[PDB]
Amino acid sequence: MYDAYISYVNNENDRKFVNFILKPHLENKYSHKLLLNNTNILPGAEPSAELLMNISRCQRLIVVLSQSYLEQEWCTTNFRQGLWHLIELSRKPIFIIFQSQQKQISQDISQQLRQHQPCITMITWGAHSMTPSSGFWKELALVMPR
Amino acid sequence: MYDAYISYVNNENDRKFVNFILKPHLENKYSHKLLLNNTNILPGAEPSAELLMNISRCQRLIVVLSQSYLEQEWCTTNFRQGLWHLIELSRKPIFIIFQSQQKQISQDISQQLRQHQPCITMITWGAHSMTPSSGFWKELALVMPR
């Protein structure tokens, strides 16, 4: 049924980005019906129940992979296992990272994300974005359904 | 229409493996209809003609990634780009490698294949295999259609 599933953590910056920037744009021009939650989709580095039951009715998975998101226990203790689970559960999860925060992204996380690069989409957000013609919205459009 | 696409090079070992072991087994119990060619699917490290037109009517891609296969030009000159094209063209290409030949496989290629590990399937062939219940045939069954 749904076009995408949006996994984020509920840090102020992140929730304004999800609810004011991203959710309105994908719901308008691209006509999408979105599912989204700010809980831990990988408790114990194993898929949660809400995610196991909900993802099967979503075509894509967008992770708002911020510094606050990357502080979660699965991110800090077994990012490979969780990334495996994401890739295996949706096929081509999209990961939104932030140019301002890439300072903070630890070595192993950036390497794991580039390593799988054809499989996963890495989208980056800078000052350039928000103009609907943008590297960001171009990329996110090409990886969305139809 | 087709279950799998089998890319091999036509070195003695390879064509006998494709035609006597693999094609008969996958076409029997697993009821598969197989497409296969021994030409270069990545000329100039870009998809060939038959591969682009045929792959759209195939659900899986198996590469018989032997020592002889890896001597081809795209393998030796731009294996990352060709692997990118494969991942982008089929969704989870399967790569059959040989335990006897993993000896000969250079560093960069083995590591590129492990890098993408959730996305691509790596199946390895040893003395154990050919018993239809096999680490090999179990794995190859779990990555095949339905």
From TrEMBL, chains A, B:
Residue ranges occupied by any TIR domain in the UniProt entry: 1-144
Superkingdom of the source species: Eukaryota
Family, similarity comment: Belongs to the interleukin-1 receptor family.
Protein's UniProt name: SIGIRR protein
Organism: Danio rerio (Zebrafish)
Source taxonomy: Eukaryota, Metazoa, Chordata, Craniata, Vertebrata
Gene name of the encoded protein: sigirr
